[PDB]
Each structure stands twice: as C-alpha cells, then as structure tokens.
Design a protein around this ligand. Structure first.
Ligand SMILES: O=C(O)[C@H]1O[C@@H](O[C@H]2[C@H](O)[C@H](O)[C@@H](O)O[C@@H]2C(=O)O)[C@@H](O)[C@@H](O)[C@@H]1O
Ligand SMILES: O=C(O)[C@H]1O[C@@H](O[C@H]2[C@H](O)[C@H](O)[C@H](O)O[C@H]2C(=O)O)[C@@H](O)[C@@H](O)[C@@H]1O
Length: 231
C-alpha cells in the first residue's frame, strides 16, 4: 500500500498551507485532506522521507499551491507589498524517463502568469551556451512571447543527491539561492508591481513533453513557505 505524505512530521507545516492540484489545476486535495492522509500514486511518501509527485501529460501537474494557513482560502500577495516572501525546498530530481523534457518544480505564479519557474530541463541553449540535464530559472519581465519578456538562467546541473533551493521576494526584487549560494541576485520584478494575486507553488508541472504517457517524477526532502512576520 502507498504510504501517505502526512504520516511523518516533515511536511505538515506546508501541507497546512497548501492545496494539491492534480492532474490539472483542478483541486485534488484540500489542505485538510492532505493533513488527513490523502494519498495516491501521484502524491505519496517515497523511502519513508520524500514527498514524491508524479504526473504525465503535456501541461498536466501534481503541484501544491500556497493557501492561507489553517484551512484558509487561496493566498495572494504582491512583490511590492514590502514583506519578504520566502519558499524553501530540498529536492531530489531523479533521472527522468524518455519523453519528459521539462518539469517545473517551484513557481511564483499569479492569477494570469508565472513570474518565476524553477524547472529541470533535458536540453536547452541559453545566451549561446548549450546545457543538458540542468535546473533553470525562467523569470517573466513582461507578458509577451518574445525573448525580451524573459530572463533565463542556468542555476545548477542536476545532482543525484538533494539540492536545496530558496526563493526570496522583497521590494520588487527576486533572489534565488541554490545549495547555499546566491545564483540570482536581486532580479527586477517591478513589472509586477501592484499585482496582488501572487503565490508560491511546488511539485511537478510537466512542460513540452514529447510523449504524453511519460511520467515525470520529483522527490521533495523538504518544502516550506517561511513567514517573516510569525503570525
Ligand atoms: O516555448 C517555450 O518552451 C517557452 O515556454 C515558456 O514557458 C511556458 C511554459 O513552457 C509553460 O507553457 C507555462 O508555464 O507557460 C510558460 C510561459 O508562457 O511563460 C518560457 O520558458 C519561454 O522561455 C519558452 O520560450
Ligand atoms: O491551469 C491553469 O491554467 C492555472 O490554474 C491556476 O489555478 C487556478 C484555477 O482557476 C483552478 O481551476 C482553481 O480554481 O485554482 C486556481 C488557483 O489556485 O489560483 C494555477 O494552478 C496556475 O498555476 C495555472 O496556470
């Protein structure tokens, strides 16, 4: 039988502040249901320690979406509200099966757009350099489709072992720290000033696969939204 993520203590804080969306953005499990032992092949405890997400299909997901804590509704915050918004994780990205090409593992998203995607990607060239099997950040600085709307950065080559991430937003600036080192230092998010619908996400969101039956799989050793105001 499949062991439930809530059977250990590690993820209870974030489960109390998230809903699970699967296999689309449709609700799969409320925060209460997650804390109550919701489990399936898409979302279960692997190795007695990892919150594991699995999903197949282009643009499908198995993803946590930040909620107001203690049974609250969907959160919305703004890059320019003056508060520091922080998400931390420790992630084991396994080798992905053929047909999986890009898997978004953390986001800042709003009602209409992804401000930030951290994604594993099989192969991509950035600024004239080819990279394989790596973790990328994609920041939107506009809503258009041309390259001037994005800042894309190689964060790290994929490691077999756990990799730590931290996302911080304060005063319209974004910092991404990977394995303790700052890789994105104060990226401008001021295009999004006044958008009050931002929230964190984490899990597996499957982008541009070449087979819709190929199952993406991501293991979280830790995940939290860190509240700088201590409510
Ligand atoms: O053609 C691309 O791969 C294009 O995708 C962009 O990311 C999109 C994702 O693939 C998903 O469709 C979803 O998350 O929307 C994203 C978006 O529209 O921002 C960027 O990665 C872009 O650089 C790239 O050209
Ligand atoms: O699937 C999408 O295109 C986006 O869905 C978003 O979730 C919202 C959506 O209205 C859902 O049907 C449900 O109501 O939850 C909403 C929400 O939590 O904001 C996000 O999952 C977004 O990341 C997707 O891009």
């Amino acid at each position: 039988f499949l062991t439930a993520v809530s059977s250990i203590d590690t993820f209870l804080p974030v489960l109390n502040e998230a809903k699970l969306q699967w296999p689309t953005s449709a609700l799969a499990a409320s925060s209460e249901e997650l804390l109550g032992g919701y489990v399936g092949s898409q979302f279960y405890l692997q190795d007695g320690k990892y919150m594991q997400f699995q999903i197949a299909g282009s643009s499908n997901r198995c993803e946590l979406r930040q909620m107001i804590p203690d049974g609250g509704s969907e959160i919305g915050w703004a890059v320019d509200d003056g508060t520091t918004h922080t998400a931390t994780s420790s992630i084991v990205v396994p080798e992905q099966v053929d047909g999986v090409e890009e898997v978004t593992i953390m986001q800042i998203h709003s009602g209409e757009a992804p401000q930030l995607r951290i994604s594993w990607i099989r192969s991509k060239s950035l600024d004239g350099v080819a990279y394989e099997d790596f973790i990328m950040s994609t920041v939107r600085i506009g809503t258009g489709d041309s390259s001037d709307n994005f800042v894309k950065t190689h964060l790290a080559d994929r490691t077999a072992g756990a990799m730590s991430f931290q996302i911080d937003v304060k005063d319209s600036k974004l910092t991404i720290t990977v394995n303790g080192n700052v890789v994105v230092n104060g990226q401008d998010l001021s295009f999004w000033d006044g958008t009050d619908s931002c929230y964190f996400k984490a899990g597996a969101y499957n982008n541009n696969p070449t087979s819709e039956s190929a199952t993406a799989r991501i293991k979280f050793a830790a995940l939290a939204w860190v509240d700088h105001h201590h409510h």
